[PDB]
Design a protein around this ligand. Structure first.
Ligand SMILES: CC[C@H]1OC(=O)[C@H](C)C(=O)[C@H](C)[C@@H](O[C@@H]2O[C@H](C)C[C@H](N(C)C)[C@H]2O)[C@](C)(OC)C[C@@H](C)C(=O)[C@H](C)[C@H]2N(CCCCn3cnc(-c4cccnc4)c3)C(=O)O[C@]12C
Ligand SMILES: [K+]
Ligand SMILES: [Mg+2]
Ligand SMILES: [Mg+2]
Ligand SMILES: [Mg+2]
Ligand SMILES: [Mg+2]
Ligand SMILES: [Mg+2]
Ligand SMILES: [Mg+2]
Ligand SMILES: [Mg+2]
Ligand SMILES: [Mg+2]
Ligand SMILES: [Mg+2]
Ligand SMILES: [Mg+2]
Ligand SMILES: [Mg+2]
Ligand SMILES: [Mg+2]
Ligand SMILES: [Mg+2]
Ligand SMILES: [Mg+2]
Ligand SMILES: [Mg+2]
Ligand SMILES: [Mg+2]
Ligand SMILES: [Mg+2]
Ligand SMILES: [Mg+2]
Ligand SMILES: [Mg+2]
Ligand SMILES: [Mg+2]
Ligand SMILES: [Mg+2]
Ligand SMILES: [Mg+2]
Ligand SMILES: [Mg+2]
Ligand SMILES: [Mg+2]
Ligand SMILES: [Mg+2]
Ligand SMILES: [Mg+2]
Ligand SMILES: [Mg+2]
Ligand SMILES: [Mg+2]
Ligand SMILES: [Mg+2]
Ligand SMILES: [Mg+2]
Ligand SMILES: [Mg+2]
Ligand SMILES: [Mg+2]
Ligand SMILES: [Mg+2]
Ligand SMILES: [Mg+2]
Ligand SMILES: [Mg+2]
Ligand SMILES: [Mg+2]
Ligand SMILES: [Mg+2]
Ligand SMILES: [Mg+2]
Ligand SMILES: [Mg+2]
Ligand SMILES: [Mg+2]
Ligand SMILES: [Mg+2]
Ligand SMILES: [Mg+2]
Ligand SMILES: [Mg+2]
Ligand SMILES: [Mg+2]
Ligand SMILES: [Mg+2]
Ligand SMILES: [Mg+2]
Ligand SMILES: [Mg+2]
Ligand SMILES: [Mg+2]
Ligand SMILES: [Mg+2]
Ligand SMILES: [Mg+2]
Ligand SMILES: [Mg+2]
Ligand SMILES: [Mg+2]
Ligand SMILES: [Mg+2]
Ligand SMILES: [Mg+2]
Ligand SMILES: [Mg+2]
Ligand SMILES: [Mg+2]
Ligand SMILES: [Mg+2]
Ligand SMILES: [Mg+2]
Ligand SMILES: [Mg+2]
Ligand SMILES: [Mg+2]
Ligand SMILES: [Mg+2]
Ligand SMILES: [Mg+2]
Ligand SMILES: [Mg+2]
Ligand SMILES: [Mg+2]
Ligand SMILES: [Mg+2]
Ligand SMILES: [Mg+2]
Ligand SMILES: [Mg+2]
Ligand SMILES: [Mg+2]
Ligand SMILES: [Mg+2]
Ligand SMILES: [Mg+2]
Ligand SMILES: [Mg+2]
Ligand SMILES: [Mg+2]
Ligand SMILES: [Mg+2]
Ligand SMILES: [Mg+2]
Ligand SMILES: [Mg+2]
Ligand SMILES: [Mg+2]
Ligand SMILES: [Mg+2]
Ligand SMILES: [Mg+2]
Ligand SMILES: [Mg+2]
Ligand SMILES: [Mg+2]
Ligand SMILES: [Mg+2]
Ligand SMILES: [Mg+2]
Ligand SMILES: [Mg+2]
Ligand SMILES: [Mg+2]
Ligand SMILES: [Mg+2]
Ligand SMILES: [Mg+2]
Ligand SMILES: [Mg+2]
Ligand SMILES: [Mg+2]
Ligand SMILES: [Mg+2]
Ligand SMILES: [Mg+2]
Ligand SMILES: [Mg+2]
Ligand SMILES: [Mg+2]
Ligand SMILES: [Mg+2]
Ligand SMILES: [Mg+2]
Ligand SMILES: [Mg+2]
Ligand SMILES: [Mg+2]
Ligand SMILES: [Mg+2]
Ligand SMILES: [Mg+2]
Ligand SMILES: [Mg+2]
Ligand SMILES: [Mg+2]
Ligand SMILES: [Mg+2]
Ligand SMILES: [Mg+2]
Ligand SMILES: [Mg+2]
Ligand SMILES: [Mg+2]
Ligand SMILES: [Mg+2]
Ligand SMILES: [Mg+2]
Ligand SMILES: [Mg+2]
Ligand SMILES: [Mg+2]
Ligand SMILES: [Mg+2]
Ligand SMILES: [Mg+2]
Ligand SMILES: [Mg+2]
Ligand SMILES: [Mg+2]
Ligand SMILES: [Mg+2]
Ligand SMILES: [Mg+2]
Ligand SMILES: [Mg+2]
Ligand SMILES: [Mg+2]
Ligand SMILES: [Mg+2]
Ligand SMILES: [Mg+2]
Ligand SMILES: [Mg+2]
Ligand SMILES: [Mg+2]
Ligand SMILES: [Mg+2]
Ligand SMILES: [Mg+2]
Ligand SMILES: [Mg+2]
Ligand SMILES: [Mg+2]
Ligand SMILES: [Mg+2]
Ligand SMILES: [Mg+2]
Ligand SMILES: [Mg+2]
Ligand SMILES: [Mg+2]
Ligand SMILES: [Mg+2]
Ligand SMILES: [Mg+2]
Ligand SMILES: [Mg+2]
Ligand SMILES: [Mg+2]
Ligand SMILES: [Mg+2]
Ligand SMILES: [Mg+2]
Ligand SMILES: [Mg+2]
Ligand SMILES: [Mg+2]
Ligand SMILES: [Mg+2]
Ligand SMILES: [Mg+2]
Ligand SMILES: [Mg+2]
Ligand SMILES: [Mg+2]
Ligand SMILES: [Mg+2]
Ligand SMILES: [Mg+2]
Ligand SMILES: [Mg+2]
Ligand SMILES: [Mg+2]
Ligand SMILES: [Mg+2]
Ligand SMILES: [Mg+2]
Ligand SMILES: [Mg+2]
Ligand SMILES: [Mg+2]
Ligand SMILES: [Mg+2]
Ligand SMILES: [Mg+2]
Ligand SMILES: [Mg+2]
Ligand SMILES: [Mg+2]
Ligand SMILES: [Mg+2]
Ligand SMILES: [Mg+2]
Ligand SMILES: [Mg+2]
Ligand SMILES: [Mg+2]
Ligand SMILES: [Mg+2]
Ligand SMILES: [Mg+2]
Ligand SMILES: [Mg+2]
Ligand SMILES: [Mg+2]
Ligand SMILES: [Mg+2]
Ligand SMILES: [Mg+2]
Ligand SMILES: [Mg+2]
Lengths: 48, 271
RNA sequence: GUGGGAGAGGGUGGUGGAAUUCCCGGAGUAGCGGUGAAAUGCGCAGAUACCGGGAGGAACGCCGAUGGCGAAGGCAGCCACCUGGUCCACCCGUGACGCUGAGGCGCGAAAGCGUGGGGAGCAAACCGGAUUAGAUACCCGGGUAGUCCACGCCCUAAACG
RNA sequence: CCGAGGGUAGGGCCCGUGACUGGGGCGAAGUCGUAACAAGGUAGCUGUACCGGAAGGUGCGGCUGGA
RNA sequence: AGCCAUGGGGGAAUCUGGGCGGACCACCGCCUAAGGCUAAGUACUCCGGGUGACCGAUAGCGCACCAGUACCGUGAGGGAAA
RNA sequence: GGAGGCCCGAACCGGUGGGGGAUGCAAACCCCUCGGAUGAGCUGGGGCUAGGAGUGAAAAGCUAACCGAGCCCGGAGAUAGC
RNA sequence: AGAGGGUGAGAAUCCCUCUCGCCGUAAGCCCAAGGGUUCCUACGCAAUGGUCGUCAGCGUAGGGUUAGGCGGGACCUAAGGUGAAGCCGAAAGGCGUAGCCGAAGGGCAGCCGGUUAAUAUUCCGGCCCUUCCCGCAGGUGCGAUGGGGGGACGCUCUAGGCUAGGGGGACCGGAGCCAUGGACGAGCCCGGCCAGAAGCGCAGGGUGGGAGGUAGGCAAAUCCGCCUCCCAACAAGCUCUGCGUGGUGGGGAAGCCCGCAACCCCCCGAAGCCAGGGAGCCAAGAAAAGCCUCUAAGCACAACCUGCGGGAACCCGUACCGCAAACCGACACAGGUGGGCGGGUGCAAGAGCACUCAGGCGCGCGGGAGAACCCUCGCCAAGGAACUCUGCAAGUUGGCCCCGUAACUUCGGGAGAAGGGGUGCUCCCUGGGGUGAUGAGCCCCGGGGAGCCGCAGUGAACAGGCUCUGGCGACUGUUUACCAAAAACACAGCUCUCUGCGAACUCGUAAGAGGAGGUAUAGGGAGCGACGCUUGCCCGGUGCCGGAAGGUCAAGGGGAGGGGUGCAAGCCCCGAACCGAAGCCCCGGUGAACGGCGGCCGUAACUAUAACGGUCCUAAGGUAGCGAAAUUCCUUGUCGGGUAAGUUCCGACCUGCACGAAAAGCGUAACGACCGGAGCGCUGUCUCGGCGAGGGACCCGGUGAAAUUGAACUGGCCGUGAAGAUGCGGCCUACCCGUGGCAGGACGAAAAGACCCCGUGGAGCUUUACUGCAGCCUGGUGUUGGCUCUUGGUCGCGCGCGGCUGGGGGCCUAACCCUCGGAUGGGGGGACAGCGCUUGGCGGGCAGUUUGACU
RNA sequence: CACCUCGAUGUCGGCUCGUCGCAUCCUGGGGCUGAAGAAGGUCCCAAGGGUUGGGCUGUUCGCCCAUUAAAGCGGCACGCGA
């Protein structure tokens, strides 16, 4: 049945996007964190 | 009039629909002067702030003329009476001699191919707009400005009217359809006559859709929810409020007056 | 047929004054109201009474009759329009074309009903006050439908000469 | 083939009858009140409506078979 | 319940000023608000080094190893093992 | 003539009863059977609304497979007379 | 599924062939999304593959994706997002005009074929376009981001032509085939097309043309719009699509030794095309650019326009999967996933159903048995609901055509009522329809006769059991994703209520917004919940509404009087009258506001009863209508009906434990996968079981889990023991080990019991618990201003002039606030509102908590 | 009463399968009888076997229907839901 993952690249970038992160000072801090944690990906990877 | 239907289906057996008698052989609406895209949207910025709105046939917004003095002493011919989907009234689309066309909301009595005109020099006849000053006491009038130059704002619902009840020099006294007695300024343009399509009140929706078509989503009885939801609600096995009838938000809803007192409107209203 | 007449006959629209009620102001004070007597009620939160103004609805006083009109129910300010009946005259026309009338159709007071509007006065219901053995009544103070309007029903009557 | 009739199904009318129920009639001397007939002690009757232990009351219009 | 501060209201003077010394007043005394700057001595440790009655691969940092990885989560985020 | 929250019935949406499944094919399935099926229909895509908040034809339903207050991280080694 | 042949160390599992089965609105084909190399090919088989594995979606490697025209982007706008200007917020940041971004929407140029192992509307081929730049003849007032038109729109129904597609053909073309009894045939088998500019035709869409006036589209227009008249007018024309044809270019089967080059006729025919077509209807149905036209500034040595030439024409995607082994579901997971195509025959139709093309599959373990048992399935004597909570289940019924159908009803319905009959095939005669053309084939509806066969003709698949009767609900709807689909919610409709518009209300600190580009016929809130008939009485309490008195009442005002300190004036404190809001008290109204709607006596010229009376209490004592009820305890009340028998059901009675009127009362046609009751039909439900089928179970080969598990060498009975013993005692019994079975025990497993209690645990919820807060109310005061009218208390002093202040009445405008074709302004409100501080109040809307112990 | 079991001993009734007790409902033996007979009563001995089909209700029970030799009563975690 309709499960919880309904992959949509637009939605994905639109939502967890890097630009998306940088608009909200929340998001900014997210990035801040993952950087300081040395995450390899600051943002959900999606490409097209 | 109003069309009843035979009951070839339940709901159809009760559902009266409007008498489209005096809808100028027209249908589609004069673009230009009207219409704009009409932004449907049941909430605001974010959140629902008026429940049970939503869906309901799409509408072009016929942009009507609610101040008539742009066109003082410029007669116009009543080009047509057309259905306007965003009102109980019916719009009259007039062709101005001037070239310009606008729709006024259409008073009872109005007819395709008739001169109407705005201004203090205006004959006192169906459809002509005039600042109240110049309207004979005790005449029925609609589309009334409230303050001057601010737009018609009163009686404009359908068979809505207002009576000029007399004057206070720089003012004038309207019986608003409310039955309210209010001082309104002389300068305020009302337009002669009553709103017409007065038959609107008498239509029976019928089926529970239709209501839906009107963008009116199903309303749910506070009592029928739970205490989280509503003052009524819970305590269940059916239930009687538990007093006293209230809104979702708490304020009493049987008879609790709500207009604020110190509202400058006053010495302007009476009953 | 020509010419005239009387008429609350019918329908629509408009309009006038009186009066009741309420509302605002002025003034003014110890009761008003009501009855057989009262009490309820109303009134120093200023009523009744008086003056002015305003809103609204219904009925149209005098004329008014023991009168008029309609087939009946029934119809009463005034105005306008629309319209029915009806009587007189002149003896012109048609030339019996008449009468009644099961059925049908129409109309049909009041109350009642549906949907809207309206609502001042009156007022079933109902509420009190008296009275009374009681008083689900008569009398008193309130007062809802209703009474009015539009349309649709109902179709009854001491619809009585 | 038609056919007595038998069968199945479904209707129509009629009679009987049924817990219980509605009123109606009659019943020498029952209870409650008194409505009506005399201004019947609130004129009466009335169609209607509403109401009430009951007669009945009241509203509305109506008749006089009342003043 | 002063002192310092100050959202509101009222509202001075310029040293015969004016704040303070724990309500207040009086003496006595202290100090000069409503402008601003000012190193040093202080804090921390991403980073370099030094040292350890610190660990020694289930310890020690989550990671000694190609770890914030694999993997998990839509995401924030979680997070190994070797 | 061709109206309808009209009828029967596929798609499509559903989820009534029963059986099966029950370390399943499946953390909601399968079969048979049933509801709706021009509508308050179903649906793709693009959007908006969120935690005492949303959304809710109302079940305290749903809000990323457990919602009478989501999840993550933090306060945090909460507190636990157990 | 079978076999044969390959391959290979090794093949049930790879390759090939033949045979078999399955799908065929797919289980085939295309597209989107997602996935991201999974594509192709060569080598491979450790692992992945539920077995195998030579194979693979796996490993290593190499190769493959080619665009002006397809899709996106150098176009447009939608919601929304963003955001100059502007507004607001402690900071973060929230808003917000324009604009900008934003698409599956609008706009725009490519069709057919051929080529690769893998790409192709891209490469090639043929034909045919598009836009930008330059250039020349000849032609026009040229010129926007502005103006206008256009774009540009719903739903249902639908015409006319086409096309796609499909069906025949005796015709054209063909390799061929004559089996097995017959057939050398107007035999059988295959195929008889695609694309194509301009011109044509045919169909259809769009479109009056003038002329003059113009106060409008923000004085730019000859454009548009609005007036006016010689013509013209159910048209022609003019453009624009579609479809034919079309120079020409392609394709081109069944078939064998292993490769010969038709192409037409008839019919059916779309939901697709023409397309902005038509009609009807209400719920009234995007925007913007492209496009056209208009004029501006500028400019006319331009510039457009029209051609014709020549140049120029980027970025990105393009394999492959794509209903699934490549996407979402940890899996090669029976689930989930949008769009398009989806052939043929037959069944009334169809996308249903069976079979079948094209195409694709046989589902990545097999082989055997042929037990129990389970699953799914078939049949059954006699019976026919006796099963059972219950006809649960299953059966029966079943399509179409004809006949025929009741109560009741809202009149549509109830109806598919019910309940029958028909149903194939052959031959004969005959009526109309479409296409042709009026003959003809060709499909298409029929009717009428005879006649054949069978157990049976919707011969298979798809396919209602029916009726009566209550309860709840009007009805279609909605719902507890994952135990409830309901009588719950919703619902049209009814009532109450708030709200006059900067509405009330909601969200927000605010700005801003929703409300609503609405305006009382409207919007909010509440309850009721079609419709019918109705909805009584009681305002003592609570709520709400009204009430310029009174009572109480905070800050503040006021200062009698009292005090602290000073030699002092002074400086400080308290501090009475007294004026001082809302709120409460108080008065009154209010029931579709919260709510409430009694008790005890007595009474009939028989008794049984109580219409009547009496009395207590009440705020008033339950009206109508229901009534052992979705309510009735007693209770299976009692009668009646139904049954052989009826705690149910149905109809009645009412002493209604404990109905009752919009938390509506009582009814109601229709509706209902709702819950009762009954009947017929029919049945494996049952008496009562039997047989049979297949998937398992069993056996062999392959692969190989699981929770659980103190260790075990784990018997019965009496006892005993923490009170239910393999484990103690006594006795009995018992060779050791399995396999298939069954479930009594191991207080078996599972989840540190949900019940219960406990904890000075937690949460959700309520309120007239506490205490706050938001919110609203409110006095004072700041913002806050002007001119008059009018009455006060205070000390002088002489009830009259002077202090000092205030209150109320108006008025104004200029703050503030709202608005108005753009504003140094006008109009409206107006010192009020708003907002700041401060006063009190209301305040489950919200929050934090409390809500004892013994027992 | 609160003794095992609240880190679970599933709770009524039904069906299925029984098995035990006997305080026996039948059937078999008996005594007394207010036992003439045949019927009963009552008590004693004795489960070996047997102990029906329905209606109603979830019921157990019970009331009913129709029978019968009788329509027994209990226990078994009110036996029996791995
Ligand atoms: C096995 C499947 C379930 O069966 C039962 O539910 C079984 C009937 C029981 O309920 C079981 C007997 C209970 O135990 C009893 O608890 C009692 C409180 C006491 C009893 N005593 C023994 C103590 C004890 O035994 C209990 C609690 O199970 C609830 C045991 C406990 C372990 C469970 O709850 C248990 C985990 C259940 N559960 C989810 C709950 C079910 C939700 N669900 C339902 N259907 C689905 C579903 C369906 C289809 C598809 N997907 C999901 C999901 C499971 O996934 O396993 C279950 C056992
Ligand atoms: K326990
Ligand atoms: Mg997941
Ligand atoms: Mg996308
Ligand atoms: Mg999305
Ligand atoms: Mg926004
Ligand atoms: Mg936002
Ligand atoms: Mg009002
Ligand atoms: Mg509702
Ligand atoms: Mg609820
Ligand atoms: Mg909530
Ligand atoms: Mg409340
Ligand atoms: Mg609440
Ligand atoms: Mg209840
Ligand atoms: Mg409640
Ligand atoms: Mg007065
Ligand atoms: Mg003559
Ligand atoms: Mg006559
Ligand atoms: Mg009348
Ligand atoms: Mg009426
Ligand atoms: Mg009276
Ligand atoms: Mg009448
Ligand atoms: Mg008379
Ligand atoms: Mg017969
Ligand atoms: Mg009398
Ligand atoms: Mg009398
Ligand atoms: Mg009398
Ligand atoms: Mg009467
Ligand atoms: Mg009376
Ligand atoms: Mg200081
Ligand atoms: Mg100081
Ligand atoms: Mg000191
Ligand atoms: Mg410094
Ligand atoms: Mg260091
Ligand atoms: Mg170091
Ligand atoms: Mg480590
Ligand atoms: Mg080691
Ligand atoms: Mg570690
Ligand atoms: Mg991830
Ligand atoms: Mg007709
Ligand atoms: Mg339908
Ligand atoms: Mg249906
Ligand atoms: Mg199901
Ligand atoms: Mg269910
Ligand atoms: Mg099951
Ligand atoms: Mg179905
Ligand atoms: Mg259907
Ligand atoms: Mg719709
Ligand atoms: Mg959608
Ligand atoms: Mg969830
Ligand atoms: Mg939680
Ligand atoms: Mg929360
Ligand atoms: Mg919580
Ligand atoms: Mg802490
Ligand atoms: Mg097919
Ligand atoms: Mg892709
Ligand atoms: Mg790879
Ligand atoms: Mg290979
Ligand atoms: Mg391998
Ligand atoms: Mg393997
Ligand atoms: Mg491959
Ligand atoms: Mg590979
Ligand atoms: Mg762009
Ligand atoms: Mg743009
Ligand atoms: Mg926008
Ligand atoms: Mg923003
Ligand atoms: Mg696009
Ligand atoms: Mg597009
Ligand atoms: Mg393109
Ligand atoms: Mg390919
Ligand atoms: Mg090419
Ligand atoms: Mg010029
Ligand atoms: Mg434009
Ligand atoms: Mg040939
Ligand atoms: Mg032969
Ligand atoms: Mg052919
Ligand atoms: Mg073709
Ligand atoms: Mg013209
Ligand atoms: Mg200009
Ligand atoms: Mg001109
Ligand atoms: Mg062609
Ligand atoms: Mg052509
Ligand atoms: Mg044709
Ligand atoms: Mg643009
Ligand atoms: Mg110039
Ligand atoms: Mg490609
Ligand atoms: Mg491809
Ligand atoms: Mg598909
Ligand atoms: Mg597989
Ligand atoms: Mg799958
Ligand atoms: Mg998968
Ligand atoms: Mg699908
Ligand atoms: Mg066919
Ligand atoms: Mg068929
Ligand atoms: Mg099929
Ligand atoms: Mg095949
Ligand atoms: Mg049988
Ligand atoms: Mg048989
Ligand atoms: Mg039978
Ligand atoms: Mg039975
Ligand atoms: Mg039985
Ligand atoms: Mg069944
Ligand atoms: Mg036959
Ligand atoms: Mg045959
Ligand atoms: Mg079959
Ligand atoms: Mg039923
Ligand atoms: Mg329902
Ligand atoms: Mg009802
Ligand atoms: Mg659902
Ligand atoms: Mg559920
Ligand atoms: Mg349902
Ligand atoms: Mg708006
Ligand atoms: Mg309302
Ligand atoms: Mg309800
Ligand atoms: Mg109800
Ligand atoms: Mg009161
Ligand atoms: Mg009361
Ligand atoms: Mg009260
Ligand atoms: Mg008050
Ligand atoms: Mg004070
Ligand atoms: Mg006060
Ligand atoms: Mg009531
Ligand atoms: Mg009563
Ligand atoms: Mg009863
Ligand atoms: Mg009973
Ligand atoms: Mg009860
Ligand atoms: Mg009987
Ligand atoms: Mg009985
Ligand atoms: Mg039963
Ligand atoms: Mg009954
Ligand atoms: Mg009730
Ligand atoms: Mg009530
Ligand atoms: Mg009822
Ligand atoms: Mg009913
Ligand atoms: Mg339904
Ligand atoms: Mg249902
Ligand atoms: Mg069986
Ligand atoms: Mg068997
Ligand atoms: Mg078998
Ligand atoms: Mg094996
Ligand atoms: Mg042993
Ligand atoms: Mg023992
Ligand atoms: Mg032992
Ligand atoms: Mg031992
Ligand atoms: Mg065994
Ligand atoms: Mg066992
Ligand atoms: Mg077993
Ligand atoms: Mg256990
Ligand atoms: Mg525990
Ligand atoms: Mg609380
Ligand atoms: Mg605390
Ligand atoms: Mg305790
Ligand atoms: Mg105790
Ligand atoms: Mg214990
Ligand atoms: Mg003890
Ligand atoms: Mg245990
Ligand atoms: Mg036993
Ligand atoms: Mg014995
Ligand atoms: Mg014996
Ligand atoms: Mg004996
Ligand atoms: Mg026995
Ligand atoms: Mg039975
Ligand atoms: Mg038991
Ligand atoms: Mg069980
Ligand atoms: Mg067990």
């Amino acid at each position: 049945m309709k499960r919880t993952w309904q992959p949509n690249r637009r939605k994905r970038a639109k939502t967890h996007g890097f630009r998306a992160r940088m608009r909200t000072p929340g998001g900014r801090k997210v990035l801040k964190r993952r950087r300081q944690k040395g995450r390899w990906r600051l943002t959900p990877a999606v490409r097209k | 009039a109003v069309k009843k239907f035979k009951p070839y289906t339940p709901s159809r057996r009760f559902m009266t629909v409007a008498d489209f008698s005096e809808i100028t052989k027209t249908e589609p609406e004069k673009s230009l002067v009207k219409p704009l895209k009409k932004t449907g949207g049941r909430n605001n910025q974010g959140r629902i702030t008026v429940r049970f709105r939503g869906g309901g046939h799409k509408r072009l917004y016929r942009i009507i003329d609610f101040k008539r003095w742009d066109k003082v002493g410029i007669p116009a011919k009543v080009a047509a009476i057309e259905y306007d989907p965003n009102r109980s009234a019916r719009i009259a689309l007039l062709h101005y001699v001037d070239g310009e066309k606008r729709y006024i909301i259409a008073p009872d009595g109005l007819q395709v191919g008739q001169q109407v005109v705005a201004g203090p020099d205006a004959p006192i006849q169906v459809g002509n707009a005039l600042p109240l000053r110049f309207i004979p006491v005790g005449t029925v009038v609609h589309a009334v400005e409230l303050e001057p130059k601010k737009g018609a704002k009163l009686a404009r619902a359908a068979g809505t009217s207002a009576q000029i009840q007399g004057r206070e020099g720089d003012y004038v006294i309207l019986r608003l359809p409310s039955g309210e007695l209010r001082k309104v300024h002389g300068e305020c343009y009302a337009t002669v006559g009553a709103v017409g399509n007065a038959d609107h009140k008498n239509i029976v929706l019928g089926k529970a859709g239709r209501s839906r078509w009107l963008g009116r989503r199903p309303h749910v009885r506070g009592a029928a929810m739970n205490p989280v939801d509503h003052p009524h609600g819970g305590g269940e096995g059916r239930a009687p409020r538990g007093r006293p009838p209230a809104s979702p938000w708490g304020w009493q809803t049987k008879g609790l007056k709500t207009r604020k007192r110190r509202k400058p409107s006053s010495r302007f209203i009476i009953a």
